[PDB]
Amino acid sequence: IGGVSGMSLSRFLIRAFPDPVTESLSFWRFIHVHARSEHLKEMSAVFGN
Amino acid sequence: NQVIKDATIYLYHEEDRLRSFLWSINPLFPRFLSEFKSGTFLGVADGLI
Amino acid sequence: MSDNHDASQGYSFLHEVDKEAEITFDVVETFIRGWGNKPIEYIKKERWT
Amino acid sequence: SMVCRIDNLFSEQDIFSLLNIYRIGDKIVERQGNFSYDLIKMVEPICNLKLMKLARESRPLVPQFPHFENHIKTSVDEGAKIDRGIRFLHDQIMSVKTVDLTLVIYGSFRHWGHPFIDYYTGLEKLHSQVTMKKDIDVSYAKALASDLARIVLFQQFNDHKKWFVNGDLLPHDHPFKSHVKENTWPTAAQVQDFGD
Amino acid sequence: NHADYNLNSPLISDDI
Amino acid sequence: KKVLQTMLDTKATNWKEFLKEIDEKGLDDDDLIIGLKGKERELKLAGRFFSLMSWKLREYFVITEYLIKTHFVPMFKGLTMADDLTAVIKKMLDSSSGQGLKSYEAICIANHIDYEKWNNHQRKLSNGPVFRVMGQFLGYPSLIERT
Amino acid sequence: WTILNLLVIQREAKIRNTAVKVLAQGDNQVICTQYKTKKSRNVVELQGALNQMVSNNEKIMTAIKIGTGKLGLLINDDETMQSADYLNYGKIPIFRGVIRGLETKRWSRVTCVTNDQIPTCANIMSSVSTNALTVAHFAENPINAMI
Amino acid sequence: CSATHADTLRYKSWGRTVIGTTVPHPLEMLGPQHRKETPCAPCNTSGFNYVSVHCPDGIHDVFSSRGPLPAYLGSKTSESTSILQPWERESKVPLIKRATRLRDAISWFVEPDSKLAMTILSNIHSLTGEEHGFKRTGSALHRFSTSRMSHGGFASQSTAALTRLMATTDTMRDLGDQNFDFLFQATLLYAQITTTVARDGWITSCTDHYHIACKSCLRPIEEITLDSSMDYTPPDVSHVLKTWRNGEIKQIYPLEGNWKNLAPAEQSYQVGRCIGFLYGDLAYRKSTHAEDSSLFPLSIQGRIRGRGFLKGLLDGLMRASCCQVIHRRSLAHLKRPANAVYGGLIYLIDKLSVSPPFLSLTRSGPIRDELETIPHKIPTSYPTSNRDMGVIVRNYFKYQCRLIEKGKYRSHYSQLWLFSDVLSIDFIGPFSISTTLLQILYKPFLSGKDKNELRELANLSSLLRSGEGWEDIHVKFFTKDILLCPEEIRHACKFGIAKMSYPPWGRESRGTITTIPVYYTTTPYPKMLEMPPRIQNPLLSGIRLGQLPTGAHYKIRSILHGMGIHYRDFLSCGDGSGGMTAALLRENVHSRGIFNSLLELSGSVMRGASPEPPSALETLGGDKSRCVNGETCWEYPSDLCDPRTWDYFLRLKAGLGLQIDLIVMDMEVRDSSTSLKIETNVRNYVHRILDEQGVLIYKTYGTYICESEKNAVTILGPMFKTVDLVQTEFSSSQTSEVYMVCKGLKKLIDEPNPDWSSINESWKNLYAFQSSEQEFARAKKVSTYFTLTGIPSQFIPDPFVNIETMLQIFGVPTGVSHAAALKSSDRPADLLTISLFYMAIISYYNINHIRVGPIPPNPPSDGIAQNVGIAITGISFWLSLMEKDIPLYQQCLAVIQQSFPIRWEAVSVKGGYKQKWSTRGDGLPKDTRISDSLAPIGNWIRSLELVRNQVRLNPFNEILFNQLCRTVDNHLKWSNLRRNTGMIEWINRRISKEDRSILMLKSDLHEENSWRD
C-alpha cells in the first residue's frame, strides 16, 4: 500500500500470507480502533487510502 | 544463441498481442494471467531477465 | 574498547535515537495492547549508565 | 540488544561478563596478532562444551562423554604454551550460569576480527590432503551400490509396479526372472540368498 | 556506487 | 568470466548430445581447468577456497546435481537440501526426541561427527559403482563416476 | 558423497540392528541413537542401563568409523560431540529439545548491506526487517522483535 | 472492512473488479481473544463459529523442556526457498509442466466449448507438436497455481510454546455448510500466537476463544466462469526449441451422474469406497500421504452416515487388496486367492487402526455411534487413546469380516462413483479394474483362463501406473458405466440428519461392606497405627465381569446400599471417563450430576478435534442431558487443587441449583502435596456446595494415613458430624484402599482431634493385613455372585470374540484362535483342558520347541517372553480359583512380586538346532518381570469366567488335550510340553527361586507427533 520499505507488524503473525494488501489494511484498522490519539487515526486512515 | 535469440524475437513480436488477449477477458483473474504468461514461450525470456 | 577520547557524537546519536524511538513506540504499544492484553512502556538505553 | 528488555533475561552483570570476554580476547590479539585466531577459533567449541554440561544438569545420571572435554582441555593446555589468555577465556565461559549468555557468546566468534590469510600454506595443505594415498576395500563400495540399487528398484516397483531391469539379458537360471516378467517382488527370505 | 561498503571479500596482506 | 555473458555469447548446449558425449568419451583437456579464490569471513590462517569450474564442467556438475536432487535425494531421509524451513523443523524435532523429559524411559543420544577433510579424501575407488548405478538409472552409465 | 555416507550408516545400523535418526548436509552429520526402557527398581540398575546404552552407541559409532575408513574417510573420535540433552545442526542449537535462535548474529547485521548493494532507503531497512523476522521465527512471544 | 476496501481499491486501480486475489486476514475477522473464565459474551448470541485454544499447564517456564502436546506448524505446501540454504536456487517448474497443469482449469472456471481452452491447447501444440477433460466445481480461486504451490500460511513462532497448546478447528461447523474463502491454517496460527503472547506468565490451566468479529469478511465462494471473445493463435516454436527440450497418451473420460437424488447411505458408501481404495493404494506404495489429514477430514463427522461409510471403506480396502496380490504372489504356486485377499485386508485394517487422522474421525460422531452398535468394552480412559479406539475399530471390522470368511461377500452397490480428489489415471485404472479381480480371486480355486486373465491384469496395472497406454484387448477388464461427482470429498455429503431412548438397565449387583468408625474429641491421642503392606493382585479385579470402564461402580453401589445414602444430585470428581458418574446416574434416574476429571492428552493425538465427552455416558444413550457438564467439561479447569475448579462448580450449582446432596472424590494421587492441597480446597468449599444433611465419600489409603501426619482424617473428619472408614466386598484382594464416608455437616468445630486409640482394635480388620487364603475365600464367594446382572449385551464384549482377539494379541494366528475359541463353546463343560491348550499354543507360537531349522535360533525377546508369563499366570489364577490350588495362587503372587522364571537354551540334534526352555536350569536367563501388567492378567480371568457363566466343569483329561493339540501340530502333546518347555514344570510347582531378571532395554524409535494441514 503505497510504501517503500518498513513492513508492518502483522507480518510477525503469519510467515507467508498470500495477500499483504489486506495484512496492512487490517493492521492499520486495528491501530485506528485501539488508538488513544488523533495523530494515529488521521495517519492510519491515510496509509490505507 | 538461437534459443535466447528466438525467445527475445518472440518477445519483441508477440508481447503486445498477448497483453491485449489477457486484458480482453472480462472477469479479471490476475493469477490465471500470471500462470498463462509463465506457462508459454515468453516465460523463457522472463526467467532470463 | 578504549576510552581515551571524547565520545560526544556517540552520546548525541544515542540520545537522538532514544528520543525519536519513544515517539514511534506508540504504534507498537497500541498493537500489543489490542492484539495482546499486556501494555508496555518505553525504556531509554540511558537507564544503565 | 541486551539492555532493558521486557523479558528480563540480561542484567548489567551479564554485559560486564561479555565485555570481559571481549577484553580477554583483545589482549590475546594484542600479544599475538594474526596468529591469535588459531586460539579464538576455540570459542565456539567451548560454548558447546558449556551447553552440554548445562543440559546435563536436569538429567545428570547419564555417564559422561569425556572425548570432547579432553580434546578441549588438551587444545587449551597446548595454546596456553603460546598465549595464556585463552586459559582465562576458557575459565570465564564456564563461569556463566545461564544459557542465553552462552548463546550470545556462541554468536560472537566473529566479534574479534579476521586474519590475513596465508594462501601459500592453504594451497600446500590442500595439495597434501588431496593427493594422500588411500587404502580402500572395493567390496564395501560394491555392497553400497547394491543397496542403492535395491532401494531404487523397491521404490519404483511400489510406485509403478514394474522392474527397471531387462529379463532378456538376464540368465534363465536367475531367481529374478519370474518376478520380472510377471510383475512381482521376491520374499524377504528369497532376497537374503541374493546378497550384494 | 561502484565500490563495496562492507566486508565481502578475503583479507590479504599483499597490497599493503 | 560471468555465467550470463558466456551463455549469451556461446552456443546453446544440447543436453542430450552433451550427456551422450560425456558418457562415451568424457571431455577434452581444454575444458578441464579449475581456478581458486579464497573464502571470506573465515577465522583460519591456512585458507579455504572457492572452485571456479570451466563452462562445460560447470554445466555438467550443475545438471547432474539437479538430477540427483530431483530423483535420488528424496529416497533418503536426512538430506535437508530439497527441504524448507518447516520440514527442517519437523526433522530436528523428530531427531531431538527423548531430550529434556525428566525421565530415563526414553533417551536419545546425538553424535555430531567431525570429518577430517570430508571433501578432499574422496576417491574414485570408493564411489565408482555407487555413481555408476546412478548413471544406469538415468540412462547414461559411466556418467557420474567420471567426476 | 552424502548419499554414500548415508548408505554406509544404514548398512552399519542394520548390521548392528540399531535404530538411528540421521541429519546431514554433507560434512556435518548428526546420528541420533534412540533407546527406551522400563521403570527401574533402583538407581544401580538405571545407571547400568545407561552404561549399556552408551556402550551400544560407541559400538555403532566404531562400526561407522570402520566403514568410513574402508571408504577412505576419517572420523576424529576425539572431536565427536555426544550428548543426550543437546543437539546442534547447521549452527542452530537445540537445548533440551527446544530450538533456539542466535539473536545477536542477526542484530549484528544491521546496516550491513550485501554484495553489490549501496546503502539506500530500501536496502538499509531490509537489514533490520529480515533479521527481526528471523528473530521472531525462532522465538516465542515476538514482542522484543518489534521493539 | 479491510477486505471490501481492498476489493474496491483494486477496482479503482485496474478499472474493473478482480477475483481470486483478495484474502481476509484473521486480525479483524477474528480480532482479540475472549477468555473462557470471563463469561465469553459471544457464546450466547451464536454457536459453533469459533476457534478454541486450551493450555492445561499455561505458558510458564518455557525452554526448560519440550512440552507434552504436538505442534501445528502450518501448511503441507513447500516454500521453494529456505534461509538455511541461500546458496541454493529457487525451485522452478518446466514450461511443459506449467502449461499442462493449466488443463486442471479446463472445466473449473472455463468452458471446453470456448475460445479460451482452445488457446490453452494451442499453446501446447505450439511449443510441442503433441496435439476437453474432467469436471471441477466447489473450490476456491486463489488456491490455484502452476508455477508454484499455494501456501496458505506458515508459522512465525517457535515450538516451545506451540508444544503447550491444543487448538480446535471442529468448532467452526456452522460455517461448514458454506464454502467461504478464508483459510483455516492462518486462523489457527493467529489463535496460537495470540494465546501465547496474551498468557505468557500464566501457570494454571487456560482456555481461549476466537469468535468471528467482522462478519463482513466471510465472502462466500461463487461459481465463476471465464471466457474471452478474441482469437490468439501463438505460432509453432517446436522446430526451434528441441535443443533444450529433452524428449499423456491415453486417459479414461468418466461420465457425470445424478448425485443429488442418490440416497445418503449410498453417498456414504461411495466416499468410503474411494477413501479406502486410495488408502490401500498409498499404503502398498509405502507413501507418507497415507498419514495425511485429507484422506480423513474432520469436516464430514456430523455430515455422513456410519454404516454406509464403514461398509464402503471395507469394500474399498478389499478391492485394493485384490489389486496387490497379483504383484506380491506367484500365480504358479498360488492357490486359495481369497486367503491372500483376506490377509491383505487384515494388513490394511491393522495399519489403519493406528492412523491418527482416521481415529480422530471415529473418535466421536455417528461413525463412532455405529462402531458401538456392536458389543464391545467401554474405554477405560478419558478422551480415547489411539489404542483404545483402534481396539474398537478392530472389533467392528472383525464382526464385519466374519461373514467374509464364510465365502459370501458382494458389494452392495454395483455402480461406482468418483470425485475430484481421486481424479487421476493412477487411481481410476485399478479402481475400474478391481471389479474383475474380486470375482476372479474371491472364488475358491483358479483355472487356466483365470491365470491368463490375472497375468494380463498384472501387465495392465504395470502399464497404467507407469503412464503407458493399453491395447484394444484389455477393454473386457475395465468397469463399465463408472460415474463421477463434481464436488470433492468434504463437500459432497451435504445431506441432513434424521431419527432418544434409554437401554434396559436392571438392578445391578451389589455387595456388603465392612465399616470402622472414628470419633472426635479434644483429647489428643497418639497416632499409633502399623503400616499395612503395599501388595497387589488382580484376582478380584478379574472376577468382576461387568467391565464398565473399571470395576469401581460395584463399590459405590455397595456403599450406597449399605449405609442408607440417597441423593437428588451429586458431584463426582476424579473419575476417568464417567464410570462412577454413570453408575450414580443410572442408580437414580431422576438425578442430575456434575462430572470432573483430569484431561489426559499424552496418548491421544488430535488433528484439530475437540476432546470428546466421557465414553461411559454412552451407557445412558440419549439421556446424557442429566450430566450438566458432560459436553463442556474440557474447556474449564479440572485440577482439584486449583480453587478455580470449585468456583466453576459453585457457578454450576448457582446457575442450575441441583440441591446437591453428595460429593464423591475418587482418585489415585501420587504425592502427598497434591492430596493436602485437595483437602485444603474441599475444606473451604464444602459448606457452599454441600447441604447440612449431605454426604462425602473420599477415597484414600491406610498407607498414606500411617505415613502422613496431616491427611483427610485430621482435616475433613471434624467438620462433619458422623464419619467412618469403609472397605467393600467388591474391592481388590489385598489393599489399603478405604473410603472415608462422612455424613452431616457441623456448624462449628469443637472436636478437631481424632481418637486413634479406638482404631487399633479395628485397623487390623482391613484386607491388606489378612492372609492370601482369607482373600482367596472371598474371591470364590464373589465369583459365585452374578456380577453381570442387569447389564445389556450392548456393553459387554462377546466371550468368543474376546478370547479370539486376546489369543491374536499373544502371538497366536487368526484362524487358529478362531477355532480354539469356537472349541470353547463346543463343550464348555471341560474348559480346564481348553485353557491349558491355550497356554500350550501360546508358548508354542511364541517359543517353538518343535521346528528344527538349520540356523541356531536367536534367543527370545521382550514381548515374546512377557506375553508367555502374562498368559501363564493369568490362566493359573483361574485354574487355582476353579480347583482350589492355593499354592499355585501364592506362586502367581510371588512371581508377580519377584519375577517370572524363564530359562532358555538351544539343543543340537539331527537337523541341527532346536530351542528349548524351562524354569529351573542355569541356561540363558530371559526371566521377565510382570508388575505393570496386571490388567491383562485380569482380562484373562474375565474372559474365562465370561465363557464359563457359572457352569460346572469336568476334570482334566489328557486325551482331549492331545486331540486339540494335534489340530495345531502332530508332535505337540502333554509329553513334549514336559521335557522341552517347562510349562508342566510351572504348573506342578517347580520353578527357580532366584530372581535372575534385569531391566529391559531396546533400540526403538521415539514417536514425535506433528503435522501440516
Add this chain to the structure above:
Amino acid sequence: TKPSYFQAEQVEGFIQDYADEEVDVVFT
C-alpha cells in the same frame, strides 16, 4: 484331595509383513 494334574548383549535389537496361511475361507 488335590487338583486334576499331578506328576507320577543387554540391549535388545530394533527388529525382532503379510499373512496368508493363517487364514482359510470356506464356501457353501
